[PDB]
Amino acid sequence: GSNNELYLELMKLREHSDQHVKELKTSLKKCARETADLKFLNNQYAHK
Amino acid sequence: SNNELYLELMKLREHSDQHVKELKTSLKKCARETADLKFLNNQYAHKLKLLEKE
């Protein structure tokens, strides 16, 4: 399956890059949530 | 044909890599904002507990 091997390799490279996007997206969501929690406390602190 | 499928997978990979570089930029920017807020909150928390005394 020489044609199959080429398909699997291209699929491998395709998914690896997609998983990297998925990883970075999750990390960005997490950081954005941490920013939200800190800014929430920041607003209650400043309003004193 | 499979060649169209192959070219599709290649195009998907290149778009994802371009998307990766953009995400690394945003993540790096967010990390600084989080660090600034965390540093600012520690000052506010101290200043607030400083006023509670007296």
Author numbering:
A (entry chain B): 1 to 48
B (entry chain A): 2 to 55
Task: Quote the original article.
Coiled-coils are important protein–protein interaction motifs present in ∼3% of all eukaryotic proteins.
The two-stranded parallel coiled-coil fragment encompasses amino acids 82–144 of human CEP135 (referred to as HsCEP135 82–144) that contains one cysteine and one methionine per monomer. Notably, Cys110 of HsCEP135 82–144 is located in a heptad d core position and has been shown to be able to form a disulfide bridge in the context of its two-stranded parallel coiled-coil structure. These results suggest that under the conditions tried, HsCEP135 82–144 does not form a coiled-coil structure. The thermal unfolding profile of HsCEP135 82–144 under oxidizing conditions revealed a cooperative unfolding profile (Tm of 62°C) characteristic of a well-folded protein.
